[PDB]
Amino acid sequence: GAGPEMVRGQVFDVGPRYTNLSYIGEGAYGMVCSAYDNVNKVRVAIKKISPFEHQTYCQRTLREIKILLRFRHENIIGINDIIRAPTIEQMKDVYIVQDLMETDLYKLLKTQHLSNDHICYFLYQILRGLKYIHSANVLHRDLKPSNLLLNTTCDLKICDFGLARVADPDHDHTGFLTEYVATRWYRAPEIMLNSKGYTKSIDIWSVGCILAEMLSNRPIFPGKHYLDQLNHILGILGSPSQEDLNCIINLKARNYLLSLPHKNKVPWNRLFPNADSKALDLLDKMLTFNPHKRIEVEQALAHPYLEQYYDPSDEPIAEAPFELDDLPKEKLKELIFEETARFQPG
Numbered sequence: 001g002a003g004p005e006m007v008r009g010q011v012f013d014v015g016p017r018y019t020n021l022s023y024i025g026e027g028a029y030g031m032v033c034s035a036y037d038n039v040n041k042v043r044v045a046i047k048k049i050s051p052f053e054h055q056t057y058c059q060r061t062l063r064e065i066k067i068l069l070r071f072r073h074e075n076i077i078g079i080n081d082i083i084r085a086p087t088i089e090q091m092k093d094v095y096i097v098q099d100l101m102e103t104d105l106y107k108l109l110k111t112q113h114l115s116n117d118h119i120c121y122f123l124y125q126i127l128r129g130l131k132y133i134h135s136a137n138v139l140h141r142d143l144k145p146s147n148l149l150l151n152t153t154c155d156l157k158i159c160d161f162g163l164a165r166v167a168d169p170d171h172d173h174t175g176f177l178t179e180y181v182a183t184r185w186y187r188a189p190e191i192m193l194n195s196k197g198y199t200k201s202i203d204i205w206s207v208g209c210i211l212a213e214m215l216s217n218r219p220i221f222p223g224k225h226y227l228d229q230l231n232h233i234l235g236i237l238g239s240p241s242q243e244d245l246n247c248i249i250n251l252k253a254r255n256y257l258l259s260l261p262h263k264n265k266v267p268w269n270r271l272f273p274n275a276d277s278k279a280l281d282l283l284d285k286m287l288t289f290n291p292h293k294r295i296e297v298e299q300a301l302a303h304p305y306l307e308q309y310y311d312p313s314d315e316p317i318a319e320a321p322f323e324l325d326d327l328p329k330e331k332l333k334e335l336i337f338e339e340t341a342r343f344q345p346g
């Protein structure tokens with residue numbers, strides 16, 4: 001009949017709707033399996049989340065749920081179902097059910113050469129999903145190949161909104177070498193200099209890094225630690241201009257930059273000799289040092305590289321735009337309980 005299913009020694013308590021579980025992967029979040037959904041008659045992805053012991057896992061879980069339930073977009077992963085206990089007291093885990101995807105861009109880049117047509121289509125889809133996210137006044141803040149899911153026909157969906165925030169440009173400024181959470185190789189230079197990552201330009205940088213990694217299958221700026229990341233960026237872009245340096249008012253950040261020997265820009269076409277010239281023009285604009293001069297999502301969609309796809313009437317925006325979750329474990333358990341209530345029998 002039915003009972004608590006096991007996979008790799010752990011309870012994967014999803015039944016009876018979801019049967020024939022196969023293990024996929026693990027991490028800090030929890031465990032993921034595929035499973036046959038008996039109602040829609042599709043295999044699905046299911047992730048077990050066990051956040052209730054810590055405020056930060058609670059915060060990230062609640063963000064993801066609230067954002068993904070509000071969003072509806074072809075290039076953004078949805079939530080199909082959420083499984084949890086009927087009472088707050090009995091709820092130890094939450095299972096989030098999502099469309100099963102064949103692969104992700106991280107796995108694909110490790111194993112597959114991309115044609116220029118694939119690169120163009122993937123970049124189109126990324127920006128189309130991002131136009132929607134940014135139009136809801138949300139920042140993803142951890143865009144990277146492993147958070148771009150792909151199916152067998154190369155439809156792309158953005159996932160993992162655990163680090164997302166509402167945009168807050170008027171409170172973006174900070175001091176030099178301020179710690180940051182999102183993935184190192186996809187961090188904009190200004191994160192290490194004077195930015196909290198509360199503007200939309202943080203996401204465009206990450207997309208720029210992803211475009212570069214699609215062109216060569218290798219990360220463009222593979223820093224090994226916090227300030228080495230800025231070493232790598234400056235190694236390609238070269239020394240910032242006086243104008244760009246003048247926009248950094250903070251003296252520790254400005255004087256660090258002034259202390260460096262002069263570095264020449266590495267031309268994109270030498271770094272990417274096989275790339276489409278239009279792709280390199282768009283890359284240059286995404287990987288612009290000064291975040292105020294950096295291209296915006298809607299401009300990027302309108303770039304000649306994407307002309308075969310660009311269609312603003314088919315690149316929708318959110319009907320309903322949107323942190324403030326520095327709350328205890330116990331009240332965040334309750335909001336997750338309330339946010340998941342719609343999926344219960346009743």
Ligand SMILES: CC(C)(C)NC(=O)CN1Cc2ccc(-c3nc(NC4CCOCC4)ncc3Cl)cc2C1=O
Pocket residue numbers: 024029032045047049060061064077098099100101102103104107149159160161162163
């Ligand atoms: C805690 C919270 C909600 C803030 N963060 C996450 O839970 C982060 N995680 C981890 C994860 C793993 C898998 C999938 C997923 N994986 C597939 N397929 C696989 C098949 C094997 O190759 C790779 C793709 N299909 C659908 C989904 Cl949702 C999504 C997420 C995700 O968002």
